[PDB]
Amino acid sequence: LTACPEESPLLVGPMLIEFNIPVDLKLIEQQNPKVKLGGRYTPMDCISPHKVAIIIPFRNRQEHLKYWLYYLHPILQRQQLDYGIYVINQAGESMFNRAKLLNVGFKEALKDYDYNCFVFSDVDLIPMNDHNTYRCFSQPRHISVAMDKFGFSLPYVQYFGGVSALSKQQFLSINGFPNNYWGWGGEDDDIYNRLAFRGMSVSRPNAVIGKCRMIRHSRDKKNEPNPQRFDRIAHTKETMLSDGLNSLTYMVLEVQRYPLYTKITVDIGTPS
């Protein structure tokens, strides 16, 4: 049992990513035979140093998930990662809380395995080049750098939304993510502010390797509106230590181990 190489030899580079072809999960299971129950895979040919837990905040986007699973299982294996898929499903109908579900995912995933790396990904973003590794780096990593929906250009240098990865230590260091933004906007910039304060920076792949497509119904070129950073910097400084991993409260309603992913349905609350 040798350690896995620097970069994996299985890499293909640029890939074609499109959604004309609807997909069936049964087909994906058969196309990804080495994927054990619950969305787990561990390379046979070597030992991976990256035990990655991929967390997806979710609610009623089954179609998107199908396309996500279709493209990401093959890629993640070519990257030679020891990984698990976690779909944190918000039970409920109260406004969505992306950051809190990601926290729930961190905590729940550690109950299954000694993960040392966490990738936080929206269900609707697919990387276009398997050189954009879904793993941890020496500094917090922003993976979805150039998204087709934003013209393939980072909206602003401190944009940390979409897909990012943090080592277990990096994550603990900032007290996790905020639980109080709900769907008001800005959790991603608060998270960036947390990084700044605990003296870290943002690691990124080059812009061509960091290309990503958004799962867009049929064909829409129409570049989306540019998001502008929310100025909540004073606010992050005061609330970082009290809103986060240490104040995280929720109730796991149900846990299902599907062939391709683990689905944890939780009740996380309502805004107050």
Swiss-Prot record:
Detected in milk (at protein level). Coiled coil: none annotated. UDP-alpha-D-galactose binds at P57, F58, R59, N60, R61, F96, N97, R98, V123, D124, W184, H217, S218, R219. Keywords: Cell membrane, Cell projection, Disulfide bond, Glycoprotein, Glycosyltransferase, Golgi apparatus, Lipid metabolism, Manganese, Membrane, Metal-binding, Secreted, Signal-anchor, Transferase, Transmembrane, Transmembrane helix. One of its GO terms (biological process) is negative regulation of epithelial cell proliferation. Belongs to the glycosyltransferase 7 family. Homodimer; and heterodimer with alpha-lactalbumin to form lactose synthase. Interacts (via N-terminal cytoplasmic domain) with UBE2Q1 (via N-terminus); the interaction is direct. The gene is B4GALT1. This is Beta-1,4-galactosyltransferase 1. GO terms for molecular function: alpha-tubulin binding; beta-N-acetylglucosaminylglycopeptide beta-1,4-galactosyltransferase activity; beta-tubulin binding; identical protein binding; lactose synthase activity; manganese ion binding; N-acetyllactosamine synthase activity; UDP-galactosyltransferase activity.
